[PDB]
Amino acid sequence: MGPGFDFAQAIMKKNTVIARTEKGEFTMLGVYDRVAVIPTHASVGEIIYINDVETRVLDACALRDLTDTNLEITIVKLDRNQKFRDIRHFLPRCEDDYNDAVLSVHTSKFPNMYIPVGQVTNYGFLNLGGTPTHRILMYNFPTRAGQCGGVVTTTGKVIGIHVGGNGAQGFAAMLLHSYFTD
Known part of the structure; x- marks a missing residue:
């Protein structure tokens, strides 16, 4: 508007893509290459669904600050055939x-x-x-x-x-x- x-x-x-874990469907922001972010409470595992396609997770890192406090951001690298x-x-x-x-x-x-x-x-x-x-x-x-x-x-x-x-x-x-x- x-x-x-x-x-x-x-x-x-x-x-964006639609990400599905065992904890639900989430909006997922793609940032660059095959790297995206999702809330840490999505509990990303070894496999995730991306626009309803079974996708291997190459890396998942739940960020914490240098006080070792949760930031609730998980950075995910996806085994996808296309870059953001x-x-x-x-x-x-x-x-x-x-x-x-x-x-x-x-x-x-x-x-x-x-x-x-x-x-x-x-x-x-x-x-x-x-x-x-x-x-x-x-x-x-x-x-x-x-x-x-x-x-x-x-x-x-x-x-x-x-x-x-x-x-x-x-x-x-x-x-x-x-x-x-x-």
């Missing part, structure tokens, strides 16, 4: 707050879904499902579970992936450029 939605749609149309458009230049370098973000989701349950969530706070610490978690972004939108893995964007930046909510607020794990140096 406006330039934030334009940027979000460009990312969804070329840099490289979008690492859209990743922020530092922790920050943002205005006017969009949360975008694409699953069987929620196809072509886009949500203007407004202001995004650098919230920091969250007790996520009982797990101490760092680098959390917050927005004041009544998100639900089905949008976990959803992509959080501003115009020109891919800033996070949706990981949870409390009924009135949603929470995303930050994406930082430093996670995807090769």
